[PDB]
Structures are given as C-alpha cells and as structure tokens.
Ligand binder design. Structure first.
Ligand code: CDL
Ligand code: UQ
Ligand code: PLX
Ligand code: PLX
Ligand code: PLX
Ligand code: PEE
Ligand code: PEE
Ligand code: PEE
Ligand code: PEE
Ligand code: PEE
Ligand code: SF4
Lengths: 318, 175, 115, 71, 83, 70, 105, 98, 156
C-alpha cells in the first residue's frame, strides 16, 4: 500500500514533466509571436508522447573515448535523485515525514550536481568538460547563499519540518515577512536548476550542448526529464516556503488545488523569464552571488536572528 | 543478526574506504569518498543522529565538488587509473577487501580479539537505551547548546576560520 | 524503511529506463560514429589534459564558508534557550566574523579570477 | 500514569526472562540464576538485550528501530 | 559631520547593496539591546515546561510552594495570555 | 490564440493533483479513516505503541473509548 | 606544562564538557550518570594512585555500564544454551516469547 | 565492542595505511586525509549517541570545522607545488635531503 | 494473421512517433540557411510541426544541407553526418547542395552533397522559399510514414 503511494507520486510527476515541455514550447512560441506545437494531437497534446517514443527508439551512442561506467551511471543518478526530491513535500501530507526535510532537500540537491560532473568528465570530450567545470563554478557561486537564505527564512518556522510551514503561514504568507529574502531565493533557484539566464552547463550558443553533448536517445531523455522535474520540484518548494495555502484537515484537496496552482504559476514565471533575458557569464554569476547576494544575505541573517528575540516572537518548537 | 542493516552499511563504508585508499585517479577516489559519506550518514541516522549524518553528508558533497574541480586542473594524468587498470591499484583493492572479509569472518562466527577488544556479533541493536521520554531531540538539544554552553568553542572556531581565510590567501600569493 | 524502499524504487526505475534505451532500438556502431565530437574536425589534443581553474582561491574559500553554514544551522533550536543574550551574542559574533573574512578576501582581490 | 505502566511492563518482562532462565539453564555446571553483573545493588535500567533477548525478531526490530524508521 | 555625509552619498550612488547590508546589520546589532521585549522572550522561553516538574517533599515550612496546581501560590502565566 | 496553451497547463495541473490526493486518500484508508498519526518525537511514538498494545487487534488507530472501563 | 588558569581565575573555559554527569541542557541524563557520579565521589581528593586501587569497584561498574561486555556475554550464553536445548527439542519456549502474548498498556 | 565499532576503526586504519603509502598524486593522499577525518567523525558520533552524552553532541561538528581548515590548507599547498612543476607528483618534492 | 496485424500496428506507431518529432541539426552553410531561418520564423513556425533545431549531432534526426559544400568542408559534413545516431535523414536544399548550382564548374566545390552522403529529399531553388522547404519537410514526413521496418523483419 506504500508501494502504491510511491507509484502514485512517481508516475504523475513524469506525466507533468512530459507536458511541461509542451507547455514550455507553446508559451515560448506565443511570446515569440508564433504558435508552437499544434499539429501532433489537438493543440499539440500528443507531442510529448511522440518525443518520448522517438527518443527511446533511437540508437544510444557510447563514445569510443568515454568511461563506460560513469557515462551510464550519471543519467540514472540524475533521474533517481529528481524523483526522490518529491517524497518529503507536504501536499498537504508528505509521503515521507522527516524532522529535517529541508536539510534532506539541501543534501540531495547538493548530490545532484555530480550527474552533470560525472557525465561531463566521462564523456571525454572538450565541450563536455567545459560544461562540467561550469557546473562546478555554478555550485560554488550559489550554495552558501542558498543555505543561509533557507536558514534565515526558517528561523520564523521554528524547525526544519516542511509540514510546519503550513502552520506558520496560516494567516499570512511568509513573502510579506521576507520578500527581500524571497527574491534572492528565487534567483538562487534559477541558478540551482541551470535555467536561463543561468544555463551555463549546457550553454547551447556557446558550448553546442555542454555536459550532455555526447548523450543521445534515452539517456539524453532522462537528463531532460530530471531537469524539468527539478524545475517543478523547486517551484513547489518555493510555493510551500513563501506562499502558504490554507489547510483544512477534513478538506485536504482544497490545499492540494491551491498548492498546485501556485506551483504552476511559479513554473510559468520560470518559462516567462527564459524568454526575456540574455545569458549571464559564469564569472559574472559568481560575482553576482558573492558580492551582492552574500553580504545582503549575511545582514538579513543577523536581522532575522535578532528580530524574533527583539519582539518576543520565537516559534514554538524546540 | 536482525536484518543486518547496520552491518551491511558498515561493510559498504569499509569498502568505499578501500576504494579511495587504493588511490586510483582522484575522480574515482572522490566517488568512493562520496559513497562512504552517504553510507556513514545512513549509519548515523540508524542511531538517531539525523542532523549529524545529514550535516556530514552535505559537508562532504561540497568538499568533494571542490576536489573534483581541483583534480581536473592539477591531477589529470592523461590515462586516468581505475581499480582494474593497474596491478598495484587492483592489488591494494583486493588486499583491502580480503582483509575486511577475514576480519569479519574472525569476529563473526567466533569471538576473536584483534587489537583492543573482541566481538561476538549480536547485532548493534543490543546496546540501545530503552529510554522513553521527551518532546524534543536530545541530539538537536546538544548541538544547539553550542551557543549557550560552548562560548569558548565558538570563539576559537571562529578565530580559526578567519585565520584560515587569511592563511590560504597568504599561501597562494606566490611572488 | 520506507525511504529505503523509495530509493530502491527510483533507482530501479531509472536503471530499467536505461536498459530499455540500450536494448530496444537497432544499433549500428562504427568507428566514425563513436568518434569524439568537436564540431566536425578531429580534436588536436586530449580532453584529459589539465584544464586551468581561474577561480581556485574562491573554490578553496568555499570550503570554509560551507563549514560556517554547518555551524549556523542549529540556530532555530538555539533560539529556545534561556540565556538568550549569550546565544544572540555568539550568533552575531559568528556572522560578524564570517562577514569580516568575506570583506578581507574582497579587499585583497581574492574574489577576482586569475587571468 | 505512563510511568507507572512502563515500570510494570519492564518489571514483568524482566520477571518472564528470569522464569525462562530458571528453566533453560537448569543443568549448566555453576550458573547462578538471576546473577547481576554489577557489584552495586541499586537498580540499573535494562539494556533492551535484557528485555527482548528471548523474543522474536519482529518485536526486537520494533523496539529498536520503530521510531527511527517511522515516517 | 560633512565628510561622512559625502561618503554616504557616494556609497549610496555606487554600492547601494553594501550600504543596505551595513545598515541592516547595524540595526540587528543595536536594536535588541534597546528593546523591552527581549526580557519577555526570555520569560516565554522559561515558561515552556519541557520536563516533568518533580514535587517537593513537604517539610512543613514552605509557604510559597503550592500544594495543588490550582492553588494561588507559585508562578503565574497571566502576563502571557494578555500578550 | 493564447488560450490554446491552456489545455497543456490543464493536463499538467491534473497530473500534479494526483500525488497529494492519492497520499491523503491512502493515509485515510490505511489509518482507520482518520488521518495518519505524526510521530516527530519519542513521546508520540510511545503513545502510538500504547495505542497498538491496548487495541487488542495490534492496530494503533483502533481507538478504545470509555467502553473499556466496565 | 599545564597552567591552570581556569582554576586561578574561576573561568570554566572547558570543564563543563569533561564529564557526562555535569549539567546537561534540560536536565537530560547520561546513560551512566549514577555510575560516573559514584566513581567520581569515590575518587575525589585521594589522588590517582590511591583512586586506581580503592575505587576499582566503582570504575569497573562504570565500565560495565559504558560497554556492557559482561551483559552481552551472559545473554550470549543464555541464547546458546537455549539453541542447544531447542535443537534436540526439550525446551518448547512459552507462547509469550514467540509473539502470542497479551500486551499490557 | 560491536561489529560496527570495529568496522569504523578498520576504515580508519585503512585510510591511515592509504595516506602512509604514497603512489604519485598528492591529491590522493589528501583524499586519504579526508577519509580519516570522516571515520573519526562517524566513530565519535556513534560513541556520543550510544552513551547519551548530550553536550558532547556539539563535539563532532567542531571536528568537522577543523577538518575543512586542514583540507583548504592542503589544497593550497597543492596549488603552489603545481605552479612549480605543472604536476602534483610527490617525486618532485626532493630538493631537501636528510 | 495476428502477428502481421500486430507488427503493422507497431510499425505505424513507430513511424508516427518518428515523423512527428523531427529534430534537424543546427547546421547551415550559405544563402539557403537564411530561408531555413525564415522557415523557423513566426510566419511558418516549423516548431508547430514538431520540428526543433538542436546543435549536437547526437540529439538530431535530420541534416538539412543548406548551402554550397566545398572540398575543404566536405570531411566535416561527412563527420557530423556519421555522428548522428540512427535513424537519420538528409535533406538536400538548394541548387548548390543538389548538384553544385552556380558553382558547378569550380575547382573547390563538391558537385552535389549526394557524392558525400545519401540524400532522402531534394529541394530545388536558389534559394528555395521557406514554403518550399516546409513542403520538402512534409514530404520527408510522408516518406517516413511509408516505411515498413517491422513488417520486413516479420516477413524475413
Ligand atoms: C566489493 C566490490 C564491489 C564490486 C562492484 C561490482 C563488480 C565490479 C564490476 C562491475 C562494475 C562496473 C561495470 C563494468 O566495468 O563493465 C564494463 C562493461 C564493458 O566494459 P568495456 O567496454 O569492455 O571496457 C571498459 C574499460 O575496461 C574501462 O571502462 P571504465 O573506465 O569505465 O571502468 C571503470 C569501472 C570498472 O570497474 C572497476 O574498475 C573495478 C570495480 C570496483 C568498484 C568498487 C569501488 C568502490 C566505490 C565505492 C563502493 C560502492 C559500493 C560497493 C558495495 C556494494 C555491495 C552491495 O569502475 C567503476 O567506475 C565503478 C563505479 C561503480 C560505483 C557506483 C557508485 C554510484 C555512486 C552514486 C552516488 C552515491 C550516492 C550516495 C551513497 O560495460 C558495460 O557492460 C556497459 C555498462 C557497464 C556499467 C553499468 C553501471 C555500473 C554497474 C553497477 C556498479 C555498482 C553500482 C551499485
Ligand atoms: C530556442 O529553441 C529551442 C526550443 O524552442 C523550440 C526548445 O524547446 C528546446 C528544448 C527541446 C524541446 C524540443 C523539448 C523536447 C522535449 C523532450 C526532449 C522529450 C522528453 C519527454 C519524455 C522523455 C518524458 C517522459 C514521457 C512519458 C510519457 C512520461 C511517462 C513515463 C512512464 C514511466 C509512465 C531547445 C533546447 C531549444 O533550443
Ligand atoms: C517502462 C519501465 C518498466 C518496463 C517493464 C518491462 C522491462 C523490460 C526489460 C527491458 C529490456 C527491453 C528490450 C526489448 C527487446 C529484447 C532484446 C533482447 O532481450 O532480445 C535478444 C535476446 O536473445 C539473445 O540473442 C539470446 C536468446 C537466448 C540466449 C539467452 C536467453 C536464455 C533464456 C531461455 C529462452 C528459452 C525459452 C524461455 C521461455 C520463458 C537480444 O537481441 P539483440 O540483437 O542482441 O538486441 C537488439 C534487440 N532488437 C533486435 C529488438 C533491436
Ligand atoms: C583575562 C584575559 C583577557 C585578555 C586576553 C584575551 C584572550 C581570550 C579571548 C577572549 C576571552 C573571552 C572568553 C571568556 C569565556 C566565555 C564564557 C564565560 O565568560 O561566560 C560566557 C559569557 O559569554 C558572553 O557571551 C560574553 C563573552 C563573549 C565575548 C564576545 C566575543 C569576543 C572574543 C574576541 C577575542 C577572540 C580572538 C579574536 C576574535 C576577533 C557565558 O556565560 P553564561 O551564558 O551566562 O553561563 C553559561 C553556563 N550555563 C549554560 C550553565 C548557564
Ligand atoms: C500503457 C502504455 C504502454 C506504452 C506507452 C507508450 C505510449 C502509448 C502510445 C501513444 C499512442 C498515440 C499515437 C496515435 C497518434 C495518431 C494521430 C493521427 O492523426 O495520425 C494519423 C495516422 O496515425 C498512424 O497511422 C497510426 C498511429 C498509431 C498506430 C497504432 C498505435 C498502437 C499503440 C498501442 C500501445 C503499444 C505500446 C507497446 C508497449 C507496451 C494520420 O496523422 P498524420 O498524417 O501523421 O498528420 C497529418 C497532419 N495533417 C492532418 C494536418 C495534414
Ligand atoms: C532484455 C535484455 C536484458 C539484458 C541485460 C544485460 C545488462 C547489460 O549490462 O547489458 C549491457 C547493456 C547493453 O550494451 P550493448 O552490448 O552495447 O547492447 C546490447 C544490445 N545488442 O548496456 C547497458 O545498457 C547498461 C545498463 C545499466 C545497468 C543497469 C543497472 C545500473 C545500476 C546503477 C547503480 C548506480 C545508481 C546511482 C544512483 C543511486 C544514488 C541514490
Ligand atoms: C544517500 C544517503 C541517503 C540519505 C537518507 C536520508 C533519509 C532521512 O533523512 O530520513 C530519516 C529517517 C527518519 O528520521 P527522522 O524523521 O529525522 O526522525 C525519526 C522520527 N520519525 O530515518 C531513517 O529512516 C533512516 C533509515 C536508514 C537510512 C538509509 C541509508 C541508505 C544509504 C545508501 C544505501 C544504498 C546502497 C549504498 C551504495 C549506493 C551507491 C553504490
Ligand atoms: C519512456 C517512454 C518510451 C519508453 C519505450 C516504450 C516503447 C514502446 C513502443 C515500442 C516500439 C516497438 C519497437 C520499435 C523499435 C525496435 C527497433 C527496430 O526498429 O529494429 C527493427 C528490426 C529490424 O531489423 P532487421 O530487419 O532484422 O535487420 C536490420 C539490419 N539489416 O526488427 C526488430 O528487431 C524488431 C522486432 C520487434 C521489436 C519489439 C517490439 C515489442 C514491443 C516493445 C515494448 C518495450 C517494452 C519493454
Ligand atoms: C526595518 C528593517 C527591516 C529589514 C530591511 C530590509 C530592506 C531591504 C531593502 C533592499 C532589498 C533588495 C533585495 C534585492 C537583493 C538583490 C538586489 C541586487 O542588488 O542585485 C543586483 C542584480 O540582481 C539581479 O538583477 C538579478 C538578475 C537576474 C534576473 C532574473 C529574473 C528577474 C527576477 C524576476 C522576478 C523575481 C520574483 C521573485 C519573487 C518570486 C516569489 C518567491 C545587483 O547586480 P548589479 O546591478 O550588477 O550591481 C552590482 C554591481 N555594481
Ligand atoms: C555595524 C555593523 C556591521 C556588521 C554587519 C554587516 C553585515 C554584512 C555586510 C558586510 C559583508 C562584507 C562586505 C565586504 C566589504 C566590501 C569592501 C569593498 O571592497 O568594496 C569595494 C567598494 O568600496 C566600498 O567599500 C563601498 C563603499 C563603502 C562601503 C559601504 C558603505 C559603508 C556603510 C554604509 C551604511 C552605514 C549605515 C547607513 C547610514 C544611514 C544614513 C544615515 C568594492 O568595489 P569594487 O569591487 O572594487 O568595484 C569594482 C567595479 N567598479
Ligand atoms: S543554392 Fe543559391 S541560395 Fe542556396 S546556397 Fe547556393 S547560391 Fe545560395
């Protein structure tokens, strides 16, 4: 019966990823004065299925100079971690209830960078190596700031339990208390998901395809699925963190609908951002994260430590 | 003997240690250390140390990433070595595995003393506490006591970290 | 136990996808097809040659800054102590020292990449 | 109330272990039944190998990892 | 008096992020020492009963110790419900 | 159309609905129809184990009321 | 060598963390609080040479609490005798040791 | 001692043997150093959790901090040596004799 | 027969999937690449047919040879064609790629890309209009619709 819950979490996520791609293409098209997929199925609704079927019936290539074990392992790790990050999210009840769910997401997101690193290095090609090193630089840029932002926001929650965030935001959204932290968190989530304007690891215009340039067919499909699942997961995490839906214990699907709508809004905002800005330079991304975000984040961490004591507003939990 | 979960995790811990101690290319050494870190996090979680295990896994993942970046720059070695690409590395790996297996066999069926004490097995579940009380986490309370009890520790740790920044910037200056 | 089952399920699903990807289609692998890609022309050197890191000092600093967040993470639990003044003083001291280290690295050109 | 019930439960489990020990080791050369391992005579909290030693693996697994593995 | 104003103007024109960070950090340092609610926060933390309150053996001359939880003696949390 | 993007968004919303409601319904089904008990601390675990012991069917969610006091 | 500035100034830089019977947060006790307390009160003020001989009983009890070697030996012997008695079949363990018990609250 | 304790101690011994037996790369030895630190962390955490020494729960975290200072130190040296030789091989460190 | 019906249905499904998701390599040589861009432009919007450019040859299905192929460049075209995983298709667009075109009698020009790679569709014009290239792509889709690999395997 827990296996059924696992499947009911895994299969819909993959379906949403598949259709996210269609949504992504259509939104970009209409923002570019065109239509996007509207032939393969009514309103392009069968286009993701055709893409999935085409990719998995195409020949997978194993490069001659590549390291076989890491080359095959990296996409498996990417997709498995992308699926695993969903289990502690309360919608409004988590599949897995952790005392420290936030730390769990932090650690697993930190371990998801190795799929790009091992993939790029094991491809044994120059563009893949450049993509992997760009991933190293990206993580060095965003990690500390993201962690300190998370700590500063959760100081008003009282714990690292994700469900408690629903109780914290029963009357007001946390974005009205920490909007300066919310903006930096949103930018850091763009940087963490390798999304425009921070898509340096792929860098199509600069690096052809980046870390996955040598991947074809099914493994490439899994890398794409992992990336889009990460998009949806991170936006759901942001919606839980800063826009708390009201929960009725006898009426939980109201919370589920509200949370899904907020997550879709944030994902559509991601797609909107991709269509509006030029790409950063990765040294410029590091300088942005270390010279602007880091000092403000440190100051706001001090402020959000002092404020609950200042006003006698410390949250309940130990 | 019950589900052998802790013993299996500890054995994988030792195997990862043997993997990165055989000293293949530092890419594979970093992979072995990452596996060991995750498995050690699991071991610590199985004893109630959620924060410590997650904390050490998060710290190690970040550390390994820097090591991978540094390996691609300064330890590249045009034909990087895997555990089966060289007789020395394979020999060290096999020796580590065999020594681990021999020690486990000697300590499992019988009760032999290797260096300090002996073991009969019995599973690690035996030495638990039976304590039934608390609306908090003892581990979390002990770690949070650092800011009230451990003022001296905070002072020395902060001074050491600041000095470490100064020290690395002095060492890498050159001239 | 449930988390272990979830991890096993995810890894099994990914591995099964890899197996179908590699065993369902028709493979025609020849030496020209599997050669490394460098935009149509052969690579000059190896991809296993050293690749300079221009952000090496920032990379080293990242280790100490990463341990600082590990130091700072028990603050939600630390805010429940009776000696609130001491805990606040130590938390602010830790953050001030982190900010001072960042300022020192910034002023001495430690954040500029090597050319 | 919880403390009273816990005390009775622990004492009953220890007593059942003692009664089974009296039967199992009837013909062991010089085994003194119910012998402590501590020189002191004060109460010592049991080790969970003393409470669930003679029981099935299911209840041992529960008493050891039920709270940790519960999610 | 006049140098600091020009320096602040130049900093606000050139590095507003640093000015904001320093202002917020300075406020975080100073304000807790001037607030009457810090004592209230300490008292609230002290009012949380994490462990069982072990009763005292009545020796006969402790007037301030209650004999029942509802007796008027002992600490009062009336200041908290009105806060 | 711009409203032609809506069918795909609707399919994504329908897919994202399923995990939360599936979890809620499975929790109700496997916990006596009254929400899954949360045990973050050992006191709650002790309460759950006591509930399982006094239930007589080895199920914590089977609740015994004031009908067990003769 | 050791310059006892903490004793001279009454500063207590690190002595709060030396023993497990010393003022834990929320009065949480160590697993072996009583044994360590007894050993410390036995060995206080008489010096290490005298304490190593005259407080050996308390220290042995404390070590038994810390590592439980004798307890594991006793349990192993009990289970070995039980296995021997059951393999040739004259024990028949009671139903409450097999899972057929009636639990109490 | 249970089997987990001697497994952690064996991991420490293996990592020490790996450090003491250099092959060519200094980075490999630094990885062995980090592995020794990790085994120490796991061992100390297991001992502290088993005995419910509450305050000592802050000890392993501190142990992590000075681990990083050792790694960041070592990496720094690995840079300088590299800048002298274009290689992190330990055979190049032979200007000084005994 | 049941097996023949099953292989025919699977054949139709695979053909539909392949023709409905055609990913050309981001690859242009000369003037014809401008009309290829105009085909990708909003007026024609090839993306609505499921036709998306991708830079990497490993993630591509179609090579549109759009422009003159010179002797100096022919090995690179052959190489990026060889690195395409199968099934792969080639469209020859314009006079220069089809047969040399204006530069047929040149010392440095390959007289048609079909001397280097096999070609599926030839799109005439100098340049072909974006509408003509779209017609060629839909003709390639129809040709993919006609192919029967599973039936041929079954009748073996
Ligand atoms: C105890 C000992 C453990 C025994 C391991 C299993 C048996 C060893 C042989 C199989 C492993 C590799 C397969 C292989 O080499 O076939 C090549 C084979 C043919 O090779 P080839 O083309 O003829 O020539 C290749 C050249 O020789 C050159 O090719 P190459 O350079 O690529 O060869 C290198 C390869 C060759 O293998 C070796 O060199 C020797 C094997 C020693 C590996 C042990 C190192 C210790 C690392 C840590 C310990 C991990 C746990 C182990 C304990 C598990 C116990 C339950 O070594 C590896 O890379 C091993 C990496 C596997 C580790 C997976 C860890 C995942 C990390 C994810 C993050 C961590 C999460 C948190 C925790 O290629 C294939 O068949 C295609 C796919 C093959 C790989 C698929 C995925 C890997 C298989 C699973 C590995 C274990 C994962 C769990
Ligand atoms: C500026 O141009 C560009 C675009 O704009 C037109 C793009 O879209 C774009 C992105 C590429 C697109 C063409 C999207 C391609 C879509 C994927 C690659 C297909 C992957 C979809 C599947 C593999 C997901 C799984 C499908 C299943 C049905 C899920 C169910 C799983 C079972 C187990 C059940 C790029 C790179 C681009 O450059
Ligand atoms: C969505 C995720 C979940 C999916 C759930 C299902 C999981 C499916 C498993 C994934 C693999 C899918 C592969 C589908 C095609 C099968 C490929 C292979 O198994 O068939 C042949 C296996 O046959 C071998 O040649 C040897 C056969 C016999 C020798 C060993 C097998 C012994 C088993 C005993 C059989 C006797 C009768 C048994 C009756 C039960 C190998 O042929 P090969 O050309 O290489 O590979 C290319 C396949 N092509 C042709 C379709 C492109
Ligand atoms: C005599 C020497 C003076 C000159 C030499 C300087 C060299 C030493 C460096 C600094 C000395 C300060 C260390 C003193 C030990 C602190 C512990 C003690 O003083 O009490 C603490 C008082 O600490 C307070 O926070 C104030 C002191 C903190 C000072 C801020 C940091 C300044 C250090 C800067 C020097 C270090 C190197 C340079 C770094 C920039 C906490 O007391 P309290 O919490 O009530 O009770 C705890 C017991 N409970 C838990 C059972 C209730
Ligand atoms: C439980 C699921 C397991 C497998 C999962 C895989 C997903 C299932 C497969 C999805 C099926 C959808 C494909 C059907 C789309 C056909 C659309 C139709 O329009 O195509 C027509 C022809 O359709 C095809 O000939 C047949 C399509 C399908 C044939 C058999 C499908 C059998 C699928 C059953 C599942 C098998 C999976 C086996 C593994 C378990 C002609 O269109 P076309 O000319 O192009 O477009 C011209 C554009 N115009 C009109 C504007 C000018
Ligand atoms: C039905 C057919 C079943 C055959 C199974 C054989 C498995 C195998 O290794 O085959 C190799 C096969 C095909 O190679 P070829 O010989 O070129 O193609 C043959 C077709 N003509 O290659 C592969 O696809 C490799 C498949 C991957 C192995 C599956 C298991 C992988 C496990 C990964 C573990 C690491 C997980 C890391 C994440 C965990 C972190 C939380
Ligand atoms: C990779 C590392 C995975 C990390 C797993 C973290 C899971 C987690 O945090 O959940 C903790 C969870 C609940 O604890 P709390 O909710 O915090 O408090 C208890 C009160 N209910 O505790 C557990 O269930 C722990 C169970 C054991 C952990 C699993 C360890 C698995 C480690 C990897 C093993 C896989 C094989 C090893 C090799 C892999 C690559 C070859
Ligand atoms: C994640 C979403 C997608 C997941 C993947 C699910 C795919 C579902 C649909 C499967 C499509 C059916 C297989 C079509 C591709 C098969 C590969 C192929 O085309 O090879 C054709 C090949 C032709 O070769 P030859 O004529 O002998 O000689 C050529 C060299 N001179 O013929 C074959 O071998 C194919 C035989 C039947 C294929 C198997 C079909 C059965 C269904 C597969 C479902 C997979 C589930 C696991
Ligand atoms: C009483 C005291 C209480 C506390 C006081 C708090 C007051 C705070 C006042 C200031 C808060 C501002 C917070 C903003 C933090 C970053 C701003 C910043 O300065 O960054 C910019 C740059 O930041 C960016 O612009 C990022 C670029 C990437 C843009 C990506 C998309 C744009 C964002 C879309 C909307 C985001 C919505 C976020 C909320 C979503 C819901 C969570 C610096 O870059 P430069 O211009 O180059 O200057 C430095 C060199 N001279
Ligand atoms: C009192 C509390 C302080 C502690 C809390 C602070 C919290 C965190 C903030 C500090 C983090 C570290 C900051 C690092 C310091 C930067 C030093 C530096 O080098 O800055 C220069 C710039 O020079 C400066 O330092 C900026 C101006 C001076 C600093 C900012 C203003 C100082 C404080 C102003 C606020 C004080 C209170 C507000 C007044 C309110 C009005 C009455 C960088 O310029 P470049 O990188 O070379 O530019 C290259 C491209 N052209
Ligand atoms: S065929 Fe005409 S338009 Fe096309 S590349 Fe050649 S000269 Fe240019």
């Amino acid at each position: 019966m827990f296996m059924i819950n696992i499947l009911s979490l895994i299969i819909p996520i993959l379906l949403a990823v598949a259709f996210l791609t269609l949504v992504e293409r259509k939104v970009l098209g209409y923002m570019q004065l065109r239509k996007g997929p509207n032939v393969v199925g009514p309103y392009g609704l069968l286009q993701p299925i055709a893409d999935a079927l085409k990719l998995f019936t195409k020949e997978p290539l194993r490069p001659a100079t590549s390291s076989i074990s890491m080359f095959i392992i990296a996409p498996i790790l990417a997709l498995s971690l992308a699926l695993t990050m969903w289990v502690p999210l309360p919608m409004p009840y988590p599949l897995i209830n952790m005392n420290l769910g936030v730390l769990f997401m932090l650690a697993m997101s930190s371990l998801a960078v190795y799929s790009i690193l091992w993939s790029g290095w094991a491809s044994n090609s120059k563009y893949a190596l450049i993509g992997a090193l760009r991933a190293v630089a990206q993580t060095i840029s965003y990690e500390v700031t993201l962690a300190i932002i998370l700590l500063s926001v959760l100081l008003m929650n009282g714990s690292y339990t994700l469900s408690t965030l629903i109780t914290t935001q029963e009357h007001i959204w946390m974005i009205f208390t920490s909007w300066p932290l919310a903006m930096m968190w949103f930018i850091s989530t763009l940087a963490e998901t390798n999304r425009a304007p921070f898509d340096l690891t792929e860098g199509e215009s600069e690096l052809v395809s980046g870390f996955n340039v040598e991947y074809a067919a099914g493994p490439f499909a899994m890398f794409f699925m992992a990336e889009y699942a990460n998009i949806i997961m991170m936006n759901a995490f942001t919606a839980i963190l800063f826009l708390g839906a009201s929960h009725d214990p006898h009426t939980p699907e109201l919370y589920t609908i509200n949370f899904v709508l907020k997550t879709l809004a944030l994902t559509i905002t991601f797609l909107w951002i991709r269509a509006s800005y030029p790409r950063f330079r990765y040294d410029q991304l590091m300088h942005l994260l270390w010279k602007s975000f880091l000092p403000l984040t440190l100051a706001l961490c001090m402020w959000h430590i002092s404020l609950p004591i200042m006003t006698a507003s410390i949250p309940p939990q130990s | 003997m019950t589900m052998y979960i802790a013993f299996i995790l500890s054995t994988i811990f030792v195997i990862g240690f043997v993997g990165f101690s055989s000293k293949p290319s530092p890419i594979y050494g970093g992979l072995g250390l990452i596996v060991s870190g995750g498995v050690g996090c699991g071991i610590v979680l199985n004893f109630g140390g959620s924060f410590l295990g997650l904390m050490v896994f998060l710290i190690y993942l970040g550390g390994m990433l820097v090591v991978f970046g540094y390996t691609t720059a300064m330890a590249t070695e045009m034909y990087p070595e895997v555990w089966v690409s060289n007789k020395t590395v394979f020999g060290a790996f096999v020796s580590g595995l065999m020594m681990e297996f021999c020690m486990v066999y000697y300590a499992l069926k019988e009760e032999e003393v290797e260096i300090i004490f002996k073991f009969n097995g019995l599973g690690d579940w035996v030495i638990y506490d039976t304590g039934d009380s608390g609306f908090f986490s003892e581990e979390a309370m002990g770690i949070a006591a650092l800011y009230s009890y451990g003022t001296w520790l905070v002072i020395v740790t902060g001074w050491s970290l600041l000095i470490g920044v100064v020290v690395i910037m002095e060492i890498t200056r050159g001239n | 136990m449930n988390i272990m089952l979830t991890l096993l399920t995810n890894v099994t699903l990914a591995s099964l996808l890899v197996l179908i990807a590699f065993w369902l289609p028709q493979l025609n692998a020849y030496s020209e097809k599997t050669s490394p890609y460098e935009c149509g022309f052969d690579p000059m050197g190896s991809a296993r040659l050293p690749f300079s890191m221009k952000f090496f000092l920032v990379a080293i600093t990242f280790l100490l800054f990463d341990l600082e967040i590990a130091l700072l993470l028990p603050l939600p639990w630390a805010s429940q102590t009776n000696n609130l003044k001491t805990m606040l003083t130590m938390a602010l001291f830790l953050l001030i020292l982190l900010a001072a280290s960042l300022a020192y690295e910034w002023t001495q050109k430690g954040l500029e990449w090597a050319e | 109330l919880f403390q009273a019930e816990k005390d009775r439960r622990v004492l009953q489990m220890l007593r059942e272990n003692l009664e089974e020990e009296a039967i199992i080791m009837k013909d062991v050369p010089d085994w003194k039944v119910g012998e402590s391992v501590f020189h002191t005579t004060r109460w010592v909290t049991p080790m969970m190998g003393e409470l669930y030693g003679l029981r099935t693996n299911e209840e041992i697994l529960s008493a050891t990892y039920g709270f940790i593995w519960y999610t | 008096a006049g140098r600091i104003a020009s320096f602040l103007k130049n900093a606000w024109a050139k590095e507003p992020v640093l000015v904001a960070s320093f202002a917020i950090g300075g406020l975080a340092i100073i304000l807790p020492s001037l607030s009457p609610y810090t004592n209230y926060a300490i008292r609230i933390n002290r009012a949380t009963p994490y462990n069982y309150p072990v009763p005292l053996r009545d020796d006969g001359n402790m007037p301030d110790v209650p004999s029942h939880p509802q007796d008027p003696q002992g600490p009062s949390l009336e200041w908290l419900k009105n806060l | 159309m711009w409203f032609e993007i809506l069918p795909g968004i609707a399919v994504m919303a329908a897919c994202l609905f399923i995990p939360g409601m599936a979890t809620a319904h499975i929790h109700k089904f496997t916990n006596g129809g009254k929400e899954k008990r949360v045990a973050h601390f050992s006191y709650q675990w002790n309460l759950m184990e006591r509930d399982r012991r006094i239930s007589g069917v080895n199920r914590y969610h089977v609740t015994k009321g004031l009908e067990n006091i003769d | 060598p050791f310059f006892d500035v903490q004793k001279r100034l009454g500063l207590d830089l690190d002595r709060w963390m030396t023993i497990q019977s010393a003022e834990q947060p929320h009065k949480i006790p160590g697993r072996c609080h009583a044994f360590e307390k007894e050993w410390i009160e036995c060995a206080h003020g008489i010096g290490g040479i005298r304490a190593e001989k005259e407080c050996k009983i308390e220290f042995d009890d404390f070590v038994e609490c810390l590592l439980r070697q004798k307890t594991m030996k006793r349990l192993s012997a009990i289970k070995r005798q039980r296995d021997k008695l059951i393999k040739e079949g004259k024990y028949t363990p009671p139903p409450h040791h097999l899972g057929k018990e009636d639990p109490r609250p | 001692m249970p089997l987990v304790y001697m497994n952690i101690i064996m991991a420490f011994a293996i990592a020490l043997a790996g450090l003491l037996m250099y092959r060519s790369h200094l980075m490999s030895s630094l990885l062995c150093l980090e592995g020794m630190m990790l085994s120490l962390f796991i061992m100390s955490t297991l001992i502290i959790l088993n005995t419910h020494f509450t305050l000592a729960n802050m000890m392993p975290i501190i142990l992590l901090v000075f681990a990083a200072c050792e790694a960041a130190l070592g990496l720094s040296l690995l840079v300088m040596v590299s800048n002298t030789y274009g290689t992190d091989y330990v055979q190049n460190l032979n200007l000084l004799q005994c | 027969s049941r097996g023949e019906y099953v292989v025919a249905k699977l054949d139709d499904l695979v053909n539909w999937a392949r023709r409905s998701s055609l990913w050309p390599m981001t690859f242009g040589l000369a003037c014809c690449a401008v009309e290829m861009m105009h085909m990708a432009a909003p007026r024609y919007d090839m993306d609505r047919f499921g036709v998306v450019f991708r830079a990497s040859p490993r993630q591509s299905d179609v090579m549109i040879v759009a422009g003159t192929l010179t002797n100096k460049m022919a090995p690179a075209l052959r190489k990026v064609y060889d690195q395409m995983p199968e099934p792969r298709y080639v469209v020859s667009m314009g006079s220069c790629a089809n047969g040399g075109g204006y530069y047929h009698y040149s010392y440095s020009v390959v007289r048609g890309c079909d001397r280097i790679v096999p070609v599926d569709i030839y799109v005439p014009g100098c340049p072909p209009t974006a509408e003509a290239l779209l017609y060629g792509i839909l003709q390639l889709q129809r040709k993919i619709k006609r192919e029967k690999r599973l039936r041929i395997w079954y009748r073996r």
